[PDB]
Design an enzyme around this catalytic site. Sequence first.
Site, PDB file in Angstrom:
ATOM      1  CB  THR D   1      -0.933   0.054   1.254  1.00 38.21           C
ATOM      2  OG1 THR D   1      -1.699  -1.235   1.233  1.00 38.21           O
ATOM      3  CG2 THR D   1      -1.890   1.129   1.121  1.00 38.21           C
ATOM      4  CG  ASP D  17      -0.158   0.600  -4.189  1.00 38.24           C
ATOM      5  OD1 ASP D  17      -1.303   0.964  -3.587  1.00 38.24           O
ATOM      6  OD2 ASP D  17       0.654  -0.256  -3.328  1.00 38.24           O
ATOM      7  NE  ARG D  19       0.866  -7.067  -4.826  1.00 39.37           N
ATOM      8  CZ  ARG D  19       2.434  -7.479  -4.872  1.00 39.37           C
ATOM      9  NH1 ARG D  19       3.212  -7.293  -3.974  1.00 39.37           N
ATOM     10  NH2 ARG D  19       2.569  -7.705  -6.210  1.00 39.37           N
ATOM     11  CE  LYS D  33      -4.005  -0.582  -2.609  1.00 43.40           C
ATOM     12  NZ  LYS D  33      -2.602  -0.612  -2.134  1.00 43.40           N
ATOM     13  N   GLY D  47      -4.661   1.235   5.083  1.00 41.57           N
ATOM     14  CA  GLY D  47      -5.024   1.165   6.697  1.00 41.57           C
ATOM     15  C   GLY D  47      -5.835  -0.423   6.319  1.00 41.57           C
ATOM     16  CB  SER D 129       2.998  -0.772   4.206  1.00 47.03           C
ATOM     17  OG  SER D 129       2.724  -0.912   2.780  1.00 47.03           O
ATOM     18  CG  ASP D 166       8.078  -7.050   0.536  1.00 45.54           C
ATOM     19  OD1 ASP D 166       7.091  -7.392  -0.169  1.00 45.54           O
ATOM     20  OD2 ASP D 166       8.279  -7.972   1.401  1.00 45.54           O
ATOM     21  CB  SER D 169       0.734  -2.739  -6.529  1.00 43.83           C
ATOM     22  OG  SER D 169       1.301  -2.068  -7.302  1.00 43.83           O
TER      23      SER D 169
END
Lengths: 204, 232, 191, 220, 240, 240
Positions: D1, D17, D19, D33, D47, D129, D166, D169
């Site tokens: 994210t 992104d 994923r 998103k 989140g 993240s 890491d 996405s």
Amino acid sequence: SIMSYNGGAVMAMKGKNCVAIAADRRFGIQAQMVTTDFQKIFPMGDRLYIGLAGLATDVQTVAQRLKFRLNLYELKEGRQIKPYTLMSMVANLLYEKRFGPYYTEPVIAGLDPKTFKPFICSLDLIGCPMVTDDFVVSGTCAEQMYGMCESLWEPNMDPDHLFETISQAMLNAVDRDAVSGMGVIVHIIEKDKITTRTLKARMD
Amino acid sequence: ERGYSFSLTTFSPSGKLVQIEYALAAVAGGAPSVGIKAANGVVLATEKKQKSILYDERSVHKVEPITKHIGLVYSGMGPDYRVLVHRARKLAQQYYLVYQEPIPTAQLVQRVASVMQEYTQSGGVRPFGVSLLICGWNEGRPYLFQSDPSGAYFAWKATAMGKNYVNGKTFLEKRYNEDLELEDAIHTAILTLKESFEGQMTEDNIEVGICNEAGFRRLTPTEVKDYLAAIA
Amino acid sequence: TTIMAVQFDGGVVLGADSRTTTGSYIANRVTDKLTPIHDRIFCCRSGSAADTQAVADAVTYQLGFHSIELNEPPLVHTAASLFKEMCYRYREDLMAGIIIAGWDPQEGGQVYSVPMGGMMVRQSFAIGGSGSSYIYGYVDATYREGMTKEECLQFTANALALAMERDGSSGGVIRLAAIAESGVERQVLLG
Amino acid sequence: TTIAGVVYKDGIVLGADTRATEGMVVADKNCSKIHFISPNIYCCGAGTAADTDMTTQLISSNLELHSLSTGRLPRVVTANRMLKQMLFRYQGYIGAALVLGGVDVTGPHLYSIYPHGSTDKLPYVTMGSGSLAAMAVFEDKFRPDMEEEEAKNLVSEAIAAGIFNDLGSGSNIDLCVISKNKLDFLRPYTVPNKKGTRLGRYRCEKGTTAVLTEKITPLE
Amino acid sequence: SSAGFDRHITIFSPEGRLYQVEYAFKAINQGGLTSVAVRGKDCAVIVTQKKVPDKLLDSSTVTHLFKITENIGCVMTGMTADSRSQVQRARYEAANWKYKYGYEIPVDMLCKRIADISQVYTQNAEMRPLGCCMILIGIDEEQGPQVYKCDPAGYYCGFKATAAGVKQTESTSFLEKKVKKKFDWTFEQTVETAITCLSTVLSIDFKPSEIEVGVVTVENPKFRILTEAEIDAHLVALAE
Amino acid sequence: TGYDLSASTFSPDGRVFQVEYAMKAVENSSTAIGIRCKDGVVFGVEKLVLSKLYEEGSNKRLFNVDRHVGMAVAGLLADARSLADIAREEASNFRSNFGYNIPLKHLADRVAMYVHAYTLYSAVRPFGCSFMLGSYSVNDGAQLYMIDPSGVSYGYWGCAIGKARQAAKTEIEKLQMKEMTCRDIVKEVAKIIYIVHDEVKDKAFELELSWVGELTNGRHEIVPKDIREEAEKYAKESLK
């Protein structure tokens, strides 16, 4: 976990003008089975089903509350329900128990009531919807089902090869799982008819 | 308060509810309006005269949207109108939060009429004095409904509410037909609004909203001046 | 986080760093730690970010409504009384380090301290924050009664720069404000 | 994210992104998103995925209720004040990290909202993240009042820095360009990650699976 | 036509009337007062006389000009006790806009929310419908100055020249005779028409100590009450 | 008449007689006056002895709301006692929420809105009281207020409540109160009470004088008229 208390596996897969859905049959407490005829796929109108997996309490409870809200909807409106409308309905029902949540993860598959357009989606245990174009899976043996579907899925498939793909996906993934098995039932629906088959699986 | 909660409406010995028939008299003594369902859209038109040369006409609106494809006019008393508008706005979003889909016009009138029902039966309050005309083009076919302070509702091809509605009852019966365009419908909606208007009809004495399949829209006085520019 | 408040003859002088951190990562590099309430009363806040933003909006709502009724400029002691009521009542729930300062027509410059407990006290000068312990012995050896405004702007600038050099949660840029009877002089400094 | 935003000389560019993961397994290869709020305001979510979805629809419902009652275009500070006052009441139980952006009468405005209710107005923000990787590109390569294509190149570069970190996405970098008059929304703006082709024969036979019981039911 | 309790409570009569609300329209007229509002320009002017019949009675604690917010001021007619409670809701709910929504309330949106409180007193029974009237002014960005007026019935509107009190029918007849030609409004024309309309309806030619002037202008958008000295400056300026 | 049972209904001309009826119940109460000097406020109550068994300071109409605020009630005495407890309780919340003494301009607004609420509903009646409010401060000077049963509240320099409301302020206004000290006022209040109706239709009365200002250092208390007895020594000199 609580999701691993009874096991279960629900898979849906999109075809050309048709859609298929499958589940296992085993009901049991953590290691001891009880019966092999536990229903996990419920009809919600014509050409539109739903599959539930997780805690077997919340499987039967949510399927009755959702049927409660569906019949009130289809009487205030003469039409039947659209597949997007059901997904918004289920996500409302799960999010109301935000902090007391039901331990289930639904999978919705069905066609359009007017056109022929297939539809698949799945939700989390608190109601995050997720529509795809190829397949959705849920249950304890999730990672086994991703490995089969990433390799066997093709874009435009007749109802013959759609049946053989979801059969080979469910038979090989569930036999690698311990707490899922004892038979596999498959619904393959289309514009003209609905075909329900049960497969020859390992009963161990 | 004391907490009385007794209703003010009871049956006559003949079996009629007296106060609801009185509230319909206040509806007929309102500003005239007309609504026409055409083959491609719905046309609403009302008759807005200020009492003076001082009043601004860009402040208060009669044709009022509910969603982006549902509009709503009235013929009755102005202040009671604004309650059910704000009520129907909040009611339409509660549908949208549940089903993630804009509310169909048939389902909206199911719930708004239940609101107007509740002030008749409950305690200590009087009913409304406002009838409505609700429009919208949901799922290809457009719709045109009318509600009343009794709580009932109907489905009109073309109707008129307000003063001289029995004249517009006869005139729309002789003028309307099965199908027109939207532009023919606005033409015959002003011609029936010219039946009971004042001596001069301008861009500001009338106020018109339409329903395309592209959505609901109320018209600015640029178009209504250009539409009433000698087109009858 | 380090906040600063010194009164003088005309009014008061406020000052703070920015560096809103989260653990060991700076989330916000530049931050208005000082907040207007009325035209003559500021506060500088410390502790939890989401708590002190919620309290300062409530006091601005209450004090701003209160002065329109009286048709009078509010007292600085009235504003410091409202923070005390919310912090003492909702203690065990908030971590707030509020310092209230500002000019008043009845009383001139005033500085009040509301620490995490909920008490209230008037001081000649008040500091607070995490990096307040480091300059804490510098400030009372350097303070002198009867300063001018320009000395106090020089006083707090050297005072904040020592903690900003030293404390890891502090630093960034210096934001200053001078409140008097005339106006509010806000400036951003580095040095 | 990984979500990010920037304020150029005329408007706001948002990026995200595609994923959604569950545990350490990729659940979704394409998740939207960037959420709609108003015809001038959009919001990026990070989140808990269900907490951001239900929150961003409630405020989008109230601003449609508010602007239609007012009769004019909404303000970004209204959407900020609703969100920070809602999330403070739940004491951070609702895990939602939001990036709020839009163009008002006053101009463009960009905010970042934390799930306890602390908000910040900034010219550029990153959340999620992979926010630490995307802030590297901003803090190295931001200059005030950039142009249109200079800003779109920066955000697409900053999101791509998080994707090759890491929890990135199955990359379909999304862009939403908000200006004073023009609104853009680009789902497949850049596709850098292509799945390789399948080189095997997977011959399935009509009858290679045993069936115990069949059943046919016609329809209409 | 007294049927049931239609002369007493808020129910419909025959012929669709309801009498308790239209009794409130002449519940203003026991005040014995007249207020005039004028919008002509980039400004807006309120004017209303005071009446001091006692030397023992004070002079500062009489004025009906009420400062709602910094950019919104109002004038009240009708009975005094219902008027000041009405201003309490206006001061209260304007600050709830700033707290909930984060910016300053428009003058258009405030007159709606005041009229909706007067609606429920009309709608529900056993609740007395507040026999007073309110006129607002204020500057709206990208819209100019506005004048609004709210009824006890909950009917509001917004318009250029406003008369309220006892003498509406005489003053509004004079204002249409005045504002029919679009003369130049240069903030002294606005005051001069606001004074001399009331000076002809009441026929007084008054001393500088009877009236007040509320004002808002786009050069100082704060609400501003004029001083006794500068009221005399406009008064001798129209002394021709 | 036939429209005047509830306080929630209007008359056919637009007023409420239940408010009109309760005002002239205060008219039958004994006279209590109030007057303010340049550095304080002096109260004065004509109070008559019931028969003989009154015990010299019972049921007084000079109340004590706050540290620096007191009342001068007249009307139904028991109704004023409950109304005084509202004002006692109102000043305590302002102390607890804001940390300083209540301003008198704000205290009269909070009470008059509470009096206003009993003029609306059918379940309750309006109060049958009217009263005075006096205070003194160094940042505000002295103020003197006046509240009717309808809720209208504004400021005076001198006032009177009772039977002889007009007959007392006829000779209040012939005083140069702007420059007198309040110690000179105390002997001047004494004659105004003693002029009107000592024992004409009544038998006997007794004088009560409350006292707030700069000489009391902001405190509010009764006069020391047991000290020096100068009221009756000077008021009874007006026999000729």
